[PDB]
Write an enzyme that holds these catalytic residues in place. Structure first.
Site, PDB file in Angstrom:
ATOM      1  N   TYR A  69      -1.678   5.674  -2.293  1.00 52.96           N
ATOM      2  CA  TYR A  69      -2.854   5.293  -3.064  1.00 52.96           C
ATOM      3  C   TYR A  69      -4.013   6.254  -2.861  1.00 52.96           C
ATOM      4  CZ  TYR A  69      -0.224   1.011  -3.573  1.00 52.96           C
ATOM      5  OH  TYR A  69       0.754   0.093  -3.859  1.00 52.96           O
ATOM      6  N   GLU A  89       1.948   7.821 -10.773  1.00 50.14           N
ATOM      7  CA  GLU A  89       0.785   6.990 -11.052  1.00 50.14           C
ATOM      8  C   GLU A  89      -0.408   7.815 -11.520  1.00 50.14           C
ATOM      9  OE1 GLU A  89       2.423   4.029 -10.097  1.00 50.14           O
ATOM     10  OE2 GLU A  89       1.204   3.443 -11.826  1.00 50.14           O
ATOM     11  N   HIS A 143       4.043   6.491 -18.274  1.00 45.94           N
ATOM     12  CA  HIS A 143       5.192   6.367 -17.370  1.00 45.94           C
ATOM     13  C   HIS A 143       6.502   6.683 -18.090  1.00 45.94           C
ATOM     14  CE1 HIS A 143       3.349   5.246 -13.702  1.00 45.94           C
ATOM     15  NE2 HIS A 143       2.939   4.049 -14.079  1.00 45.94           N
ATOM     16  N   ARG A 193      -7.125 -15.430   8.102  1.00 49.44           N
ATOM     17  CA  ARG A 193      -6.769 -14.584   9.234  1.00 49.44           C
ATOM     18  C   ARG A 193      -6.376 -15.386  10.468  1.00 49.44           C
ATOM     19  NH1 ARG A 193      -9.299 -11.937   5.777  1.00 49.44           N
ATOM     20  NH2 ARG A 193      -9.120  -9.667   5.568  1.00 49.44           N
ATOM     21  N   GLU A 247       1.444   2.685 -19.471  1.00 51.02           N
ATOM     22  CA  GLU A 247       2.883   2.474 -19.336  1.00 51.02           C
ATOM     23  C   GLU A 247       3.685   3.425 -20.218  1.00 51.02           C
ATOM     24  OE1 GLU A 247       4.137   0.679 -17.016  1.00 51.02           O
ATOM     25  OE2 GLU A 247       2.246  -0.210 -16.373  1.00 51.02           O
ATOM     26  N   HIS A 300       0.813  -4.978   1.797  1.00 53.55           N
ATOM     27  CA  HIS A 300       1.593  -3.767   2.034  1.00 53.55           C
ATOM     28  C   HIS A 300       1.976  -3.610   3.500  1.00 53.55           C
ATOM     29  CE1 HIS A 300      -0.277  -3.076  -1.856  1.00 53.55           C
ATOM     30  NE2 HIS A 300       0.593  -2.109  -2.079  1.00 53.55           N
TER      31      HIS A 300
END
Ligand SMILES: *[C@@H]1O[C@H](CO[C@@H]2O[C@@H](C)[C@@H](O)[C@@H](O)[C@@H]2O)[C@@H](O[C@@H]2O[C@H](CO)[C@@H](O[C@@H]3O[C@H](CO)[C@@H](O)[C@H](O)[C@@H]3O)[C@H](O)[C@H]2NC(C)=O)[C@H](O)[C@H]1NC(C)=O
Ligand SMILES: *[C@@H]1O[C@H](CO[C@@H]2O[C@@H](C)[C@@H](O)[C@@H](O)[C@@H]2O)[C@@H](O[C@@H]2O[C@H](CO)[C@@H](O[C@@H]3O[C@H](CO)[C@@H](O)[C@H](O)[C@@H]3O)[C@H](O)[C@H]2NC(C)=O)[C@H](O)[C@H]1NC(C)=O
Ligand SMILES: *[C@@H]1O[C@H](CO)[C@@H](O[C@@H]2O[C@H](CO)[C@@H](O)[C@H](O)[C@H]2NC(C)=O)[C@H](O)[C@H]1NC(C)=O
Ligand SMILES: *[C@@H]1O[C@H](CO)[C@@H](O)[C@H](O)[C@H]1NC(C)=O
Ligand SMILES: *[C@@H]1O[C@H](CO)[C@@H](O)[C@H](O)[C@H]1NC(C)=O
Ligand SMILES: *[C@@H]1O[C@H](CO)[C@@H](O)[C@H](O)[C@H]1NC(C)=O
Ligand SMILES: [Zn+2]
Lengths: 592, 194
Positions: free
Chosen positions: A495, A382, A358, A149, A355, A485
Site C-alpha cells: 500500500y 493497483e 485492471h 482492543r 476495474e 491485514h
C-alpha cells in the site's frame, strides 16, 4: 545439459497448467455469483485438483539446479516453482501453524463487544464501524476504541506470539534471515546488472522517501489538529499528538471520514454528476461503455464479446445470492470478466474505470508463460488501476461527456476542497502504513523483544504518526493484531509503494500527453502516445525485473516521491498560509 | 452464362473460421436478385460503391460467406483488432470489397440453422517461453482449422495435438439466422458482366 531438461519440464508444465487453472477459476466464479452448497463443493474439488498438480510439479522442479540455468525466463519460472514455503516445516509444525492462522481469523471475524446501556452485542462490522466512522461523541468513540482492543487483541496476543516463532522457523527453512526478509523478497532482483535490487535496498528506499514526505504531512497534521480543536475543546493539546480514537475509523488508517469537519470552504459544493446521470437515464451498461470508450481513445483494445455476455454488471434479481465486492477476473484462455453491483452514481463510474484498467493490464500480458502473468511487482496493478480513476474525475473529462455544462466555471476554492479531500485519503495513510510495516519488520527481526512489543508500538505511533493513545496499554494487549491485514497474515508495504508508483506513472503520461497546467487537472484522453507508452510496460508482465519496467514507463529505475509532492503543491502552499498562526509539529510528552 | 448462387442458399452456413468460398468466372451475375432474398442490415464497400458493385465487368467474383450475428458487427471492421480478425477472418483490402451483413427470412427453408454461433479465441504454439500466436493472413484460413474441426460443446474449450492449441467459444442461435457475405472483385476482363 540441465537447461534442455528444464526447458522440456517447463514446456510440459505450461501445457498442463492451463486447463486446471481455468477449471478452478471457473468454479470459483460460479460460486461467487451463485452461492449454493453444490457450488461450494465443486469449487473445493477444483481447488484440490489444482493444489495436487502444483505440489507434484514443485516436487519435480526442485531437482533442477538454478545455478546451471543460463536463460533468465527459465530461471524465473524455476525459482517460482521451487519455493516450498510452509512445506519446508515438518508436518506437526505446519498443522500447528494452520491451526493458529484459522484461530486468529475466526477470533477477528466473530469478536463482539457488549454495550452496557442497551445490552446489545456489537461486532466490528457493521456495529463498531458505524460508531468510529460517524460519531462526534468523545466518550462513545472512546468506549468503542477501547472495547475492541480489550476484547479481541488480548485473545490474539498469545496466538500471535506463537505465530511469530513458527513463521521465523519457516523463513529460515527457506534460506531467509527471517519472515520480514522473506516478505521483502518480492522486490528482489538478481543477475541483471544495473537493474539489480536487494532486499535491504527496499528498507533504505522506504526510509528515504518517507523523510521527503514528512513536511507535507506535518502541514496537514497541523491543519487537522486546528480544525478538531473546535469539535473537541479541552480534549486536544494545541502542540501535542492527536488522540487515537478521533481519527475517523477504528485504526486511523484513513483520515477520509474527517472531511465534514475539515472542509476548507463549506459553502462551495463538490462536483457530483449523479443527478445529471439520473436526469439522462443512464444505466450500468452505459457506464461501462463510456469506460471502454475512454480506453479506446488512448489506443487500447476493445473489450471482448464474452466480456459483455458473461460479466455480472448489475445485482441480479432472480433470487441468486452474490458478493458485491467489485472484482476483475482473468479466468484464462481469453476469458475476462468483471463482477460488480453497479449503481448509477459518480463513485460507480470511477470504480468502473478502475476495474476496466485492471482488465486491460490482464489482457496486455496474456502471451506470457503462466508463472510470469502478473504485475512487475505487487504494487503495479493497483497503481495502474488508480491512474484511470485519476483521469476520469477531472472536469475536462466530465464536460466532454456532457455530464457538466459547457459554461461550467472552475473556481480555486472548489479545487482546494478537492485537493484536501484527496490528501485526507492519500497523504494521511502513508505514515500509518510505514509505521506498521516497520514495527512488523523489527518484531520478525528480533530487534524488539516480546516484553516491549506494546511499548515500542506506541512510542513509534507518537513519533512517526503524531498519534497518542487515550489509555495506556501493557503487554497483555496486542494492538497491531486488531487490524485485518496483521491478523490474516498479509504484507502491508504494497500500500506504500503503490502510492509512490501511482503519481510516478500519472506524471509521466501527462507529459507524454503534453498537458499544460497543474498536474491534478491532467486528463490523458485522446492521447495515443500515452497509451503506447503505457502498453510498453503493460505487455511485460513479470518477465522482466520491475526496475526495467519502471524505466520503460517513466525513464528512471528508482522510486521517487517528487511527482507526489508536485501533485499536492497548490494544497501545500494553501496549508502553509493557513497554519501561519499555529504550531507545526508535535511533542511526544503530552497525553490525554 | 447465368451465374449460380444456389449452393450458398442450400444447407447450413458454416462458422466463421471455416468460412465458405465461392469463385465465379465467365458469368452473368444478377446481384439484385441475390440480395433481394435477405433482409440486409449492413452494406459497407471499399474502393467501390453499392451501386457500382452491381455494374461493370470483372475477371473474377469471389464470395466468402458464413454465419455471423449482426450484434458483433463492430469486430468485423477495417482497422479493428481482436480475436475475430486475428484467428478467424481477416478481410483482404488489396481489391475492391464489400461486406454485407444480412438476416435470413423465414421464407427460405433451404437454409437450415446451426445449433450455435462459434468462433476461435486463440490459436498458438506452446513453448517454455510463452504462447506463439498464429495470425490469419489477409483472406486466408487459420492454421488451427484441423484442430477446430473436432468441434466445441462448451464455452472456452481447447483442443491440442501437442504442438498446436486452439480454443473455441459458442453461443446459441435465437430467432432468424444472421449471415455475413464478403464480396471481392478481381480484374479476360469481361468474364463476369451484369
Ligand atoms: C476526444 O476527441 C473526440 C473527437 O474529436 C474530434 O476529432 C479530433 C481529431 C478533433 O478534430 C476534435 O475537434 C474533434 O471533435 C471528441 O468528441 C467530439 O467532441 C466535439 C466537441 O467539440 C464534438 O463536436 C460537437 O458535435 C456535435 C454533433 O454531434 C455538435 O452539436 C456540436 O456543435 C459540436 O461540433 C464532436 O462531435 C465529438 N466527436 C465525436 C466523434 O463524438 C471528444 O470530446 C474528445 N474527448 C475528450 C475527453 O476531450
Ligand atoms: C483564489 O484566487 C484568488 C484570486 O487570485 C487571482 O487568481 C488566481 C487564480 C491566481 O492567478 C492569483 O495570482 C490571482 O491574484 C485569490 O485571492 C487573492 O489572494 C491573494 C493572496 O494570494 C491576494 O493578494 C493580497 O492582496 C492584498 C491587497 O488587497 C494584500 O494585502 C496582500 O498582501 C496580498 O497581496 C489577492 O488580493 C486576492 N484577490 C482577490 C481578488 O481577493 C484567492 O486567495 C484564491 N483562493 C484559494 C483558496 O486558493
Ligand atoms: C445457481 O446454482 C443452482 C444450484 O447450484 C443451479 O441450479 C442447477 O441448475 C442446473 C442446470 O444445469 C440443474 O441441472 C440443476 O439441477 C440445478 N440444481 C439445483 C440444486 O437446483 C442454477 O442453475 C444456478 N444459476 C445460474 C444462473 O447458473
Ligand atoms: C532466453 O531464450 C529466449 C528464446 O530462446 C530468448 O528470446 C531470450 O533472449 C533468452 N534470454 C536469455 C537471458 O538468455
Ligand atoms: C436482377 O434481379 C432483379 C430481381 O430483383 C431483377 O429485377 C433484375 O432485372 C435483374 N437484372 C437483370 C436481369 O439484368
Ligand atoms: C416472403 O417474404 C416476402 C417479403 O416481405 C413477404 O411478402 C411474404 O409474405 C413472405 N412469404 C410468406 C409465405 O409469408
Ligand atoms: Zn482494484
Amino acid at each position: 545439459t540441465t537447461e534442455e531438461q528444464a526447458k522440456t519440464f517447463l514446456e510440459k508444465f505450461n501445457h498442463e497448467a492451463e486447463d486446471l487453472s481455468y477449471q478452478s477459476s471457473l468454479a470459483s466464479w460460479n460460486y461467487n455469483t451463485n452461492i449454493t452448497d453444490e457450488n461450494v463443493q465443486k469449487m473445493n474439488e477444483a481447488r484440490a485438483k489444482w493444489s495436487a498438480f502444483y505440489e507434484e510439479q514443485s516436487r519435480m522442479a526442485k531437482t533442477y539446479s538454478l545455478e546451471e540455468i543460463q536463460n533468465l525466463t527459465l530461471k524465473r519460472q524455476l525459482k517460482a516453482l521451487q519455493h516450498s514455503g510452509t512445506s519446508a516445516l515438518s508436518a506437526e509444525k505446519s498443522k500447528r501453524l494452520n491451526t493458529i492462522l484459522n484461530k486468529m481469523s475466526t477470533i477477528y471475524s466473530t469478536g463482539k463487544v457488549l454495550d452496557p446501556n442497551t445490552q446489545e452485542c456489537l461486532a466490528l462490522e457493521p456495529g463498531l464501524d458505524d460508531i468510529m466512522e460517524n460519531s462526534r461523541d468523545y466518550n462513545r468513540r472512546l468506549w468503542a476504541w477501547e472495547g475492541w482492543r480489550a476484547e479481541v487483541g488480548k485473545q490474539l496476543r498469545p496466538l500471535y506470539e506463537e505465530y511469530v516463532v513458527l513463521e521465523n522457523e519457516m523463513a529460515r527453512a527457506n534460506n531467509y534471515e527471517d519472515y520480514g526478509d522473506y516478505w521483502r523478497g518480492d522486490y528482489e532482483v538478481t543477475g541483471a546488472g544495473d537493474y539489480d535490487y536487494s532486499r535491504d535496498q527496499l528498507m533504505k528506499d522506504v526510509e528515504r522517501t518517507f523523510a521527503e514526505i514528512k513536511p507535507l504531512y506535518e502541514q496537514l497534521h497541523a491543519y487537522v489538529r486546528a480544525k478538531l480543536m473546535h469539535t473537541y475543546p479541552s480534549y486536544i493539546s494545541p502542540t501535542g499528538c492527536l488522540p487515537a480514537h478521533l481519527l475517523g475509523d477504528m485504526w486511523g488508517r484513513f483520515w477520509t471520514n474527517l472531511y465534514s469537519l475539515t472542509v476548507p470552504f463549506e459553502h462551495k459544493p463538490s462536483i457530483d454528476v449523479t443527478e445529471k446521470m439520473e436526469n439522462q437515464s443512464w444505466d450500468a451498461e452505459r457506464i461501462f461503455k463510456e469506460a471502454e470508450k475512454f480506453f479506446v481513445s488512448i489506443s487500447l483494445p476493445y473489450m471482448t464479446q464474452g466480456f459483455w455476455d458473461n460479466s455480472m454488471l448489475t445485482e441480479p434479481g432472480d433470487g441468486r445470492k452474490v458478493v458485491c465486492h467489485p472484482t476483475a477476473w482473468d479466468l484464462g484462455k481469453g476469458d475476462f470478466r468483471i463482477k460488480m453491483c453497479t449503481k448509477v452514481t459518480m463513485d460507480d463510474f470511477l470504480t468502473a474505470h478502475h476495474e476496466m484498467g485492471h482488465i486491460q493490464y490482464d489482457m496486455a500480458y496474456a502471451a506470457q508463460p503462466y508463472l510470469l502473468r502478473n504485475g512487475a511487482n505487487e504494487g503495479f496493478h493497483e497503481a495502474v488501476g488508480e491512474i484511470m480513476s485519476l483521469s476520469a474525475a477531472t472536469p475536462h473529462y466530465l464536460k466532454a461527456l456532457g455530464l457538466l455544462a459547457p459554461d461550467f466555471h472552475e473556481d480555486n476554492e472548489t479545487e482546494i476542497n478537492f485537493l484536501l479531500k484527496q490528501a485526507l485519503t492519500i497523504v494521511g495513510t502513508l505514515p500509518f502504513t510505514y509505521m506498521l510495516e516497520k514495527w512488523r519488520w523489527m518484531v520478525f527481526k528480533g530487534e524488539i523483544p516480546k516484553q516491549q512489543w506494546m511499548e515500542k508500538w506506541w512510542e513509534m505511533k507518537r513519533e512517526i504518526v503524531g498519534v497518542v493513545e487515550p489509555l495506556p496499554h501493557d503487554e497483555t494487549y496486542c494492538d497491531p493484531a486488531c487490524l485485518f491485514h496483521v491478523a490474516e497474515d498479509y504484507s502491508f508495504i504494497r500500500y506504500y509503494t503503490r502510492t509512490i508508483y501511482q503519481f510516478q506513472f500519472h506524471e509521466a503520461l501527462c507529459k507524454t500527453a503534453k498537458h499544460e497546467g497543474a498536474l491534478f487537472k491532467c486528463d490523458i484522453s485522446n492521447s495515443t502516445e500515452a497509451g503506447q507508452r503505457l502498453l510498453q510496460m503493460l505487455r511485460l508482465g513479470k518477465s522482466e525485473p520491475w526496475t526495467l519496467a519502471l524505466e520503460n514507463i517513466v525513464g528512471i529505475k528508482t522510486m521517487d516521491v517528487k511527482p507526489l509532492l508536485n501533485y499536492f503543491e497548490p494544497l501545500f502552499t494553501w496549508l502553509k498560509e493557513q497554519n501561519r498562526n499555529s504550531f507545526v509539529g508535535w511533542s511526544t510528552e503530552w497525553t490525554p | 452464362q447465368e451465374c449460380d448462387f444456389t449452393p450458398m442458399l442450400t444447407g447450413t452456413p458454416p462458422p466463421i473460421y471455416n468460412f465458405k468460398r465461392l469463385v465465379f468466372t465467365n458469368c452473368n451475375y444478377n446481384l439484385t436478385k441475390l440480395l433481394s432474398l435477405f433482409q440486409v442490415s449492413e452494406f459497407s464497400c471499399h474502393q467501390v460503391s453499392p451501386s457500382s458493385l452491381a455494374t461493370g465487368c470483372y475477371s473474377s467474383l469471389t464470395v466468402d460467406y458464413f454465419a455471423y450475428s449482426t450484434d458483433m458487427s463492430s469486430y468485423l471492421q477495417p482497422g479493428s483488432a481482436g480475436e475475430i480478425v486475428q484467428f478467424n477472418y481477416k478481410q483482404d483490402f488489396s481489391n475492391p470489397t464489400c461486406r454485407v451483413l444480412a438476416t435470413v427470412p423465414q421464407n427460405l427453408t433451404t437454409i437450415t440453422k446451426p445449433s450455435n454461433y462459434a468462433y476461435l479465441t486463440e490459436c498458438y504454439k506452446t513453448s517454455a517461453y510463452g504462447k506463439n500466436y498464429l495470425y490469419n493472413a489477409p483472406g486466408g484460413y487459420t492454421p488451427c482449422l484441423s484442430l477446430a474441426s473436432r468441434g466445441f460443446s462448451t464455452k472456452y474449450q481447447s483442443h491440442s495435438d501437442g504442438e498446436l492449441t486452439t480454443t473455441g467459444y459458442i453461443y446459441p442461435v435465437t430467432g432468424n439466422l444472421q449471415m455475413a457475405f464478403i464480396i471481392s472483385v478481381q480484374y479476360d476482363t469481361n468474364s463476369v458482366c451484369p
